[PDB]
Design a protein around this ligand. Sequence first.
Ligand SMILES: CC(=O)SCCNC(=O)CCNC(=O)[C@H](O)C(C)(C)COP(=O)(O)OP(=O)(O)OC[C@H]1O[C@@H](n2cnc3c(N)ncnc32)[C@H](O)[C@@H]1OP(=O)(O)O
Ligand SMILES: CCCCCCCCOCCOCCOCCOCCOCCO
Ligand SMILES: CCCCCCCCOCCOCCOCCOCCOCCO
Ligand SMILES: CCCCCCCCOCCOCCOCCOCCOCCO
Lengths: 390, 390, 715
Amino acid sequence: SLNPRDVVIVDFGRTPMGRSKGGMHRNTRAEDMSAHLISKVLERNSKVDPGEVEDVIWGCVNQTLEQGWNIARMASLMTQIPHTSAAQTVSRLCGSSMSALHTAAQAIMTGNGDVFVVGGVEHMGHVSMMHGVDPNPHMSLYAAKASGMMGLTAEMLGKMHGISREQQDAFAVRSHQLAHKATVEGKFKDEIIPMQGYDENGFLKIFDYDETIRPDTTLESLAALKPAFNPKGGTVTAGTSSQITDGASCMIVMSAQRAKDLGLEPLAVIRSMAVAGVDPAIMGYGPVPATQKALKRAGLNMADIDFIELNEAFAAQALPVLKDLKVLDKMNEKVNLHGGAIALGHPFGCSGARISGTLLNVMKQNGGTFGLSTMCIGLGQGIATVFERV
Amino acid sequence: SLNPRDVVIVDFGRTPMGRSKGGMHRNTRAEDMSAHLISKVLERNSKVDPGEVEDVIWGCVNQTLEQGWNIARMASLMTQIPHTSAAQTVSRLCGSSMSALHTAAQAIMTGNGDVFVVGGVEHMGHVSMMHGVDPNPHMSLYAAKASGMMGLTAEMLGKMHGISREQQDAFAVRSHQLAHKATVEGKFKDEIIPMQGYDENGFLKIFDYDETIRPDTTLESLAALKPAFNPKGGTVTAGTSSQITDGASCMIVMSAQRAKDLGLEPLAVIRSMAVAGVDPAIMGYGPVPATQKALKRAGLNMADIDFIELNEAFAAQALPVLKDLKVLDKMNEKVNLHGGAIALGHPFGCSGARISGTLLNVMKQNGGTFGLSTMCIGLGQGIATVFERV
Amino acid sequence: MIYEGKAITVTALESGIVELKFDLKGESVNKFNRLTLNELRQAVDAIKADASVKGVIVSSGKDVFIVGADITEFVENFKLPDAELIAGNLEANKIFSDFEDLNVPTVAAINGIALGGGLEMCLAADFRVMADSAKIGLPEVKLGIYPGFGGTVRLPRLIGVDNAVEWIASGKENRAEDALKVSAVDAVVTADKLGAAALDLIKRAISGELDYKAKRQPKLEKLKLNAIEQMMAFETAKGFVAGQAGPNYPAPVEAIKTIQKAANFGRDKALEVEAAGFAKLAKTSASNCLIGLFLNDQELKKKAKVYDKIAKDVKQAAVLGAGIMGGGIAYQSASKGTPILMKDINEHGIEQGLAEAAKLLVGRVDKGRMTPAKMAEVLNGIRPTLSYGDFGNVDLVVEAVVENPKVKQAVLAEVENHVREDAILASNTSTISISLLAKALKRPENFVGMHFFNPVHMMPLVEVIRGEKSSDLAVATTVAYAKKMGKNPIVVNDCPGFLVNRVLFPYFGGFAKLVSAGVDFVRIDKVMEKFGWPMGPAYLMDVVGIDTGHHGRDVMAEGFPDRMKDDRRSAIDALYEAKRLGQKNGKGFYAYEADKKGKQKKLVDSSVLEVLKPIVYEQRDVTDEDIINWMMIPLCLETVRCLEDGIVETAAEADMGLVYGIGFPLFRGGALRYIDSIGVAEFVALADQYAELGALYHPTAKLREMAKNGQSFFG
Ligand SMILES: CC(=O)SCCNC(=O)CCNC(=O)[C@H](O)C(C)(C)COP(=O)(O)OP(=O)(O)OC[C@H]1O[C@@H](n2cnc3c(N)ncnc32)[C@H](O)[C@@H]1OP(=O)(O)O
Ligand SMILES: CCCCCCCCOCCOCCOCCOCCOCCO
Ligand SMILES: CCCCCCCCOCCOCCOCCOCCOCCO
Ligand SMILES: CCCCCCCCOCCOCCOCCOCCOCCO
């Protein structure tokens, strides 16, 4: 049986991943997008009193304009969540959303709250990444400035492990294809929360799919693109890179005790959490260190993990991570079975919980027991989480 | 006796609080200011291997420009801290830095790391508060927009509890007076880490005091200022409000176990952590709820606390909080004995650990046992921490 | 068809969808007159009765959706008792309420202007589509009343308290972009694809994709605000408006009290609140004519329209003289899509102009508000020059040469020989007669006066001083050119001081008298700022400059010697004769010590008392209430004279010129409305006890005439 203070993920709900360059969310603020998600998710679960939510931990990166001033509370106030609750925004670049899950997890375990609402958001359309950036010259005194350009790191990490242009493009195809498949077959119906938006004609309508996905993506269509971060001899193209996407992901979390009391069947259970660091130059290698640390704390071997969710930053980084994790030959059998950030987009402050949430749906749907969700972080970081289906 | 996973604050070091309007830090980045602090603090404690630092949790609010893109890692990379460590930036407006202390505390308790480096920073000079703000109209559908103006909330909470213009100004004088004294008597020599800066003449020199403090602040000089947030019938003036200050605060934290092994005497020990919410309109009331929750978790009555550190956001809010906490008649005996944010400035992302750190020095210096550090947060929030000297 | 009226034609469409069209046959616009409201009733009942209907689309067959309301026919329905009045509006609201209760999707395809009742009709429907070139708002406040057709009910619950209070209390119009942001509108599209949007939207509501029922709910139930969140929201709103609206509160301070009470209520109960308060305003505050304010606005929207399309398109413009005023006129013309030429005599001038225009553009880019690519276009729009070789295709030319009758005449006459004959010329002078300058030119019909206020990019108002020989086309083009530059132009006839300035100094005359009466100016402006004025008299004088105000005094004294020629050294002469030239000098009524680039400080110092001693002729005692009279009365009366001498054509224009120029407290209406706020008959009485102060406090003959007759300026 479970222990009282064991972290349990009750539910998971994400928004339709829409393009940033004039996508379906071009007229929706990140705050509202988050507030609506949290609100709708709490509805499906009428047995978890919003007043019990000790805190709302939201992940976000470019915290300015719409996303500035603790968006966690800003989005929480427009929810059925009482004013008596708290909220904080956790930023760790890419792994923001996941760190959020960890913070609440540890809180629950230590007896500092019973019910939480974690997740993350990132509206790169209204608040682009290059917006408001002030490169500190002094950084070049301790680390290469180029390491700040995620793309170039993908190039470096790629060169090292030796991944051909074809190897990457082929990966992107597998991501798009699998994403479309899961979509059409309805493997996303449970996690995707229908949301209002505007089509290319300014008309109002509800989307329940991911605009980002491109089924026509073929090796032929990808081999036509030019190197995005290194014209003179590059492999990392816009096609093998994650998409600029506006989107939010939510997740209700609580202790097994307060959970067993509400008689609601768990979606999964957190067994181990881990964060690690690597050199900024090859930040894409962050997953392996973070994963190894998680597996040890979870007392598990990489082989004991049934399904894996590796956020696809670049085909040039995902592949190497999978190779060193010794599971590349098991890809099509248990690695991102619903596609990755290449086809589903990668909302910085959101992807953390999104990949983990989708990870649970894969396990539940395919009778998995142990699952793993990890992702590389900017400036040399990594994060991993090992869930469990009971 | 010791419990292996008990949170222990090893050391604490802050920067000299300098004015933002052309102060001593007008030529220093928030990143560097933070990096230097962390680096110097680690030096004083040569027995804690920087490599063991599982994660650096830094608090920051206006995360854009200099402070954007996970400043925790950006400032950690220029430190002797290895690239193998991790870093995250936690934002909860005012209580950002304190929440950071909580995150690490919980991590240590749950066995997800042994040594941490928490703190916060906020350079309101280079990254002003009103800079890059986009008020979401939708917020007015669930809460008054005016609640977004901290000042107005101070006015509202003030009127309710009935605090006269004299009562507030008198508090400001007490803050400045007590701050200057603590400075002159050297009750700050241990916590303030000398730091390079530039005087009003562009000259280079090291400051080891707080520019913000104004000893000449008298009831006469304060009664001359005009209402800052309500000209036609106001009490909250710039004199009773915290100062716009650029500054950083650091704090090395670890488990009692790994601490006992290093044979280094603890500075304090965390017993309880708490966060609570209130209505945005009277956000300044956040401390009382958060404090009560902390006292219950620490199994202590407000009377058991020897010293208290209440972040002086506004005299109009600090006083009411102290009254309901039923310790107003104990002020001069155990409340902010070294001044507050009114004389020491209030660096958003920094104040959290700063007031807590100062709290410890007060206890250590006055043979206190139980201490309490709490602060109000924007948009209706509160946070409290109860330390212990052993 | 389902219904074919003279104002509304409910035509059927595909899939059982019906289109309720607003087309007042015979008239130019659509409005809620008796006939229209009546047909709506018949229309709604028709659709309601027809069970085959599967949705309703509301449109307009005009250039505008539905403008205000022609209240002239609702006036007799206001003199009735408060019961037969509330129930009266209630019955009218039953229409919109029913349309809101139609068990079917309803969309409002806003094609154009939808003000007052026009917007209230839209707020009734579930969804609202809007053309990017349209505008919507509730300017009821300008009439002394607030929305009476559910406006104070639906808007607050649709876009939020704060947003509603703002939209209502101010009565400002709102563009598509803004209307969409606060969510007053659900979708904005190009005029061409408006119909398609409404149709495509409705079908998505019918299919069940869009929950039209869930979207309607918000304005049928209580507000989502906390009891505490309400106290904060309302008290702050009430407070801020209370201070800038003052004692006679029309729609501003009341609208909020109406929303604060109907807060925890649903539609029906909220309607009763709205109606009740509406009756109070009509029989108290606005009883001293709502008719006037309304018809006055009517005259304007038509006047602004007559000017609008007879006006010549200004594709190419130019300004004479760079530097301060030239750089602004060039900036404004450039930032609004109007290629302008910066003409001057020396290279040093062009430098100053280009510099200032650059400082403003960079100012926005250096924080995030303007695109670097945008700053490029604007800069290219401004074209420097020291000759007239390129003035060949310029349509309108503006002069900014130094204040000198002779010089300005030479320059103006000069440019007239280097531009098309059909080109319009305009001077930016402030103390020189336009009718005088025109005499130099050989084409006075094309010469008028375009008065901008320093800074050109800050101040909204732009006076269109019409000379005695100025053609309508000349004024029309100038007015339009001002509006295109994002300004608010007002036609004013040529006269010393024009409208604004001519009224601004008599106001200062009351101040000068106070200081001479031993009254502390610090206490004075604190009272005037508590009245609603942006800046205080003394503080303003410092900003403008004692040296400037000193010169202006002579300009007005010579103009109207009979009342503006005082002859006793005042604080104005004191400071000037004492080298205290104001803020620019660093010393005026206050001291200003500069911090750095963008900031300076207002300080107090007893050293100013010494200089003012010679001005004190009596240690007269005065209340903060009287202080307001010594100031306002002289200002109001002068406005009445500007209206009587024919400087401004309508009372409406006579007040906005003060609202946008001198900075007249907005929620107090204006100089003329303020008079009505007290009562013309009761105002003359007040003026008489202050008659011992001079001709500046003496009511006009026409004012005394309309005093006994119980006549007010708005009717
Ligand atoms: C560590 C972590 O977790 S995340 C790391 C951070 N990474 C990121 O944030 C993503 C980085 N990516 C980027 O910045 C951008 O996508 C870039 C720079 C790579 C590309 O942007 P741009 O230089 O503007 O090129 P752009 O995006 O306009 O190219 C689009 C073109 O590619 C084509 N294209 C893109 N994807 C595909 C595809 N899968 N199949 C076919 N064609 C495709 C489009 O059709 C389009 O062609 P068109 O212009 O003829 O219509
Ligand atoms: C810019 C102008 C703003 C227009 C907004 C209109 C607000 C004014 O409201 C007018 C008050 O309405 C009075 C109600 O009239 C009663 C007579 O009923 C008419 C017949 O309808 C009977 C339907 O059964
Ligand atoms: C209060 C009345 C004061 C009267 C002042 C009399 C001023 C009369 O002066 C006449 C104006 O002089 C014009 C100056 O001439 C300037 C010529 O500039 C030529 C620039 O050519 C540029 C070629 O690239
Ligand atoms: C007769 C010559 C004297 C010239 C003086 C002109 C007076 C006009 O002042 C212009 C300078 O502006 C600085 C003072 O600012 C006044 C504030 O008014 C704000 C307007 O508010 C508009 C609200 O809609």
